[PDB]
Write a protein that binds this DNA or RNA. Structure first.
Ligand SMILES: [Ca+2]
Ligand SMILES: [Ca+2]
Ligand SMILES: [Ca+2]
Ligand SMILES: [Ca+2]
Ligand SMILES: [Ca+2]
Lengths: 235, 228
DNA sequence: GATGGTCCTAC
DNA sequence: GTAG
DNA sequence: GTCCTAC
């Protein structure tokens, strides 16, 4: 499925996007070359284009794009009226509170999405210097990170924010694969799962406090962006 | 993978649980006899038990249990404080509104779960009298309903509350299967998707008004139970 | 559409 | 952990 | 069982 010189196309492609990412990107392509069914479809196009020169070039920009800081807007989705009916008549939330409930529920959903995005980026910043590769841009199906281990065996990892982040359908994506999973938070007990992160260097450099600091650094940058934008429109 | 006498064992098993569901249960066991890889594995037991007499008997109780009314408590999960940090610092929710935000978020997630449950039950009420079977108790992997179409072909359907209920990983459960999917609500546009429900009997008989009447009735009933 | 992110219920 |  | 983002 992958072209005979995929590695060379990839190195060339990423040298024209971000040379600092070229070693990492070429390794992801090598993973995919050996494991072609692990290659996710490009969002628009058909499966048959996977492994071509076009796919490799397109992937290089996606790989870089996935590392760009994201500042999403609040959700502007259309609320499901039936949720408010259940809140009111089953959970006895006063009618007067339903509008604020909808807004804060919606904003909380946005926040959760942001937490999962930041979780991946924090982990990548810490473990990539120890040889792990962040598979950014959605190239490797069901995988966030890969590592070539001591015995020249590929390791694959999926990271989730919580012990209940999946359901029976989404979790099945790993069936018949060696992809491991780790999660950050517990839904039904207090604490964090950071010292169970795979690999010793992971455990020693990652922590809940380190993640919170990463999140604060990001929020400070958004406050700076807001201040600058505010001044441009109001001076 | 299913025993030759699957249908007979099914009838007898469901006769000990609820004779009013024996016809429907037997039809599901017939469906799984023709599509044995569609069968979900049982919780206590190994995969190779699927299609045996003990599996059919256990599935009878599960099938009935799946139809029991649920009355979940409010969620009592431990909140992720990072959500409140983002809510306050990113989305500008004032500090003194964070505790209410956390409670209403939790209750809304609970409410959404209930809506999906009632959505399934409403469809089941309306469509089982038109030959469809509500595959209650999760015997058929990734499937909520089955039906034998006009062309004498088994069809299977997954129902979801919303066009964004799935993600790439959960959606992939149907890859390499003929299982169809339908959703109720649109996330980014106004209205509903009810008249896209598969089969003419679905489209003619299911609606948002119908579903609202069903939900109101369901909730007035359990208010009357709490009154009593 | 597809590719990702997210939380809760019962067993 | 696993069926939703 | 559930909702949101980006292409
Ligand atoms: Ca990912
Ligand atoms: Ca992940
Ligand atoms: Ca179901
Ligand atoms: Ca369903
Ligand atoms: Ca949610």
């Amino acid at each position: 499925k992958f072209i005979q010189n995929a590695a060379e196309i990839a190195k060339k492609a990423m040298d024209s996007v971000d040379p600092s990412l070229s070693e990492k990107f070429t390794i992801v392509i090598r993973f995919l070359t050996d494991n072609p069914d692990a290659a996710s479809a490009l969002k628009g196009k058909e499966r048959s284009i996977v492994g071509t020169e076009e796919y490799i070039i397109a992937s290089a920009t996606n790989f870089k794009k996935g590392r760009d800081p994201r500042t999403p807007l609040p959700p502007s989705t259309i609320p499901d009226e039936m949720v408010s009916v259940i809140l009111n008549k089953y959970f006895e939330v006063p009618s007067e509170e339903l509008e604020k409930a909808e807004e804060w529920h919606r904003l909380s959903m946005g926040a959760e999405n942001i937490v999962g995005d930041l979780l991946e980026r924090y982990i990548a910043e810490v473990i990539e210097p120890h040889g792990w590769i962040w598979c950014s841009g959605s190239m490797v199906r069901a995988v966030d990170f890969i590592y070539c281990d001591s015995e020249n065996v590929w390791q694959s990892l999926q990271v989730k924010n919580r012990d209940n982040t999946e359901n029976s359908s989404s979790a099945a994506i790993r069936h018949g694969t060696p992809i491991k999973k780790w999660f950050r938070t517990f839904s039904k007990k207090r604490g964090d799962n950071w010292d169970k992160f795979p690999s010793l260097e992971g455990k020693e450099n990652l922590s809940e406090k380190g993640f919170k600091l990463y999140v604060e650094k990001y929020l400070s940058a958004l406050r700076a962006i807001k201040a600058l934008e505010h001044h441009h429109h109001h001076h």
